[PDB]
């Protein structure tokens, strides 16, 4: 309970015991903030929703879709090329 | 001999053996034809040179830096997430 209050003061879940961050994501979606919505969705352990948000953003307003394809290749190997490259190249983004 | 005569005509190789396609590669970075530089380098299995060319072909003056991470991760699995995503998102690039 001491953790379900913190997450509700930060405005990630509305009041109640039904803690599943759906309304916040869509409120962000038509608020006009795509990248932050992607970050929150990924933090809630779901890639595919982030892909949906990113391609939908790519529909409106050319850099988003390639980044979606980049985040598509997630790897957990101890010597993954994705790990090393995306670690060294992270600082280049804006 | 037949197929290392065809490469001579096209421009891949030089007079002699010169197995490395390098001397035709570095003749294009100076010219400023970067999107070629990766492609001709990639066909000879150079995932460690595609990053090296695209990254160095970007400092001067886009998706190129973010393509690299996607190009870094390549699994060749049966139904992996990178495989399904990159197949559809190929069509949106310029």
Swiss-Prot record, chains A, B:
- Give the superkingdom in one word: Eukaryota
Disulfide pattern? none
Which cell locations does it reside in?
Lysosome membrane
Function statement: As a component of the GATOR2 complex, functions as an activator of the amino acid-sensing branch of the mTORC1 signaling pathway. The GATOR2 complex indirectly activates mTORC1 through the inhibition of the GATOR1 subcomplex. GATOR2 probably acts as an E3 ubiquitin-protein ligase toward GATOR1. In the presence of abundant amino acids, the GATOR2 complex mediates ubiquitination of the NPRL2 core component of the GATOR1 complex, leading to GATOR1 inactivation. In the absence of amino acids, GATOR2 is inhibited, activating the GATOR1 complex.
Similarity field = Belongs to the WD repeat mio family.
> How would you summarize the oligomeric state and partners of this protein?
Component of the GATOR2 subcomplex, composed of MIOS, SEC13, SEH1L, WDR24 and WDR59. The GATOR2 complex interacts with CASTOR1 and CASTOR2; the interaction is negatively regulated by arginine. CASTOR1 and CASTOR2 convey leucine availability via direct interaction with MIOS. The GATOR2 complex interacts with SESN1, SESN2 and SESN3; the interaction is negatively regulated by amino acids.
Protein's UniProt name: GATOR2 complex protein MIOS
């Amino acid at each position: 309970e001491e953790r379900i209050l913190a997450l509700q003061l930060c405005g990630w879940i509305k009041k109640g015991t039904d803690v599943d961050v759906g309304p916040f994501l869509n409120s962000l979606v038509q608020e006009g903030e795509w990248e932050r919505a992607a970050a929150v969705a990924l933090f809630n352990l779901d890639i595919r929703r982030a892909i949906q948000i990113l391609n939908e953003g790519a529909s409106s307003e050319l850099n988003l879709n390639v980044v979606a394809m980049a985040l598509s290749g997630y790897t957990d190997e101890k010597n993954s090329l994705w790990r090393e490259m995306c670690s060294t190249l992270r600082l280049q983004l804006n």
